[PDB]
Design a protein around this ligand. Structure first.
Ligand SMILES: N=C(N)N[C@H](CCCCNC(=O)[C@H](CCCCN)NC(=O)[C@H](CCCCN)NC(=O)Cc1ccccc1)C(=O)O
Lengths: 39, 154
């Protein structure tokens, strides 16, 4: 009813994409409501 | 339109047109995160997509069929977030996943920060396969955001 979708592109790997972001290892828990929290 | 690809999830119930999330159409099934639609039916043009499966704890939901995406991070190689941010064009962001360590096992995580309306954007491996959805995560001691690589079961 109230929500609709519209296409935004193909699902493809991009050969010349930018590389960024860290790779942290984090102790987390997942509760019954689907929220992660930091341990 | 059941055309494969990545989609914005929009609503007109607030001010103007507002993007609440993103999802993946594959094999006639639309895949997104539960907190985006809250399991509500969706429109695709004149047609209707009814929910089929979902799970609040996984924070995933599928429409028109069961979950189809079964590729998984290999634990070693870099991936690409295909970020679809509100009002901005889709762009691939390559990164090396970190790791959420949980009592039930480890899963990959991407430390990339985007508006909440980017929830549901797919994460891809080098072969172009969707290895999970972006948008369920935590906030680190630095104040930055880290999302799990949330994948369903097929
Ligand atoms: N740096 C940031 N927050 N980036 C985020 C990026 C959002 C993209 C992901 N999509 C969401 O908007 C999801 C939606 C909620 C799903 C629950 N199943 N938010 C999150 O993943 C986290 C959950 C933290 C749970 C801690 N127990 N909440 C915040 O970050 C909300 C928050 C905001 C500020 C302080 C503390 C929490 C943002 O710009 O909102």
């Amino acid at each position: 009813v109230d929500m609709y979708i519209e296409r935004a592109g193909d699902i493809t790997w991009e050969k010349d994409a930018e590389v960024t972001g860290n790779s942290p290892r984090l102790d987390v828990a997942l509760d019954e409501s689907g929220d992660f929290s930091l341990v | 339109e059941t055309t494969d690809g990545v989609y914005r999830v929009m609503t007109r119930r607030l001010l103007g047109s507002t993007q609440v999330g993103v999802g993946v159409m594959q094999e006639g099934v639309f895949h997104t995160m539960w907190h985006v639609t809250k399991g509500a039916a969706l429109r695709s043009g004149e047609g209707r997509l009814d929910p089929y499966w979902g799970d609040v704890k996984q924070d995933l939901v599928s429409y028109c069929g069961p979950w189809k995406l079964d590729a998984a991070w290999d634990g070693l190689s870099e991936v690409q977030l295909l970020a679809v941010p509100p009002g901005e064009r889709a762009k691939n962001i390559q990164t090396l996943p970190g790791i959420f360590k949980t009592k039930d096992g480890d899963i990959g995580a991407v430390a990339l920060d985007y508006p909440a309306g980017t929830s549901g954007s797919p994460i891809l491996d080098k072969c172009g396969r969707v290895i999970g959805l972006y948008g369920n995560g935590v906030v680190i001691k630095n104040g930055s955001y880290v999302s799990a690589i949330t994948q369903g079961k097929r």
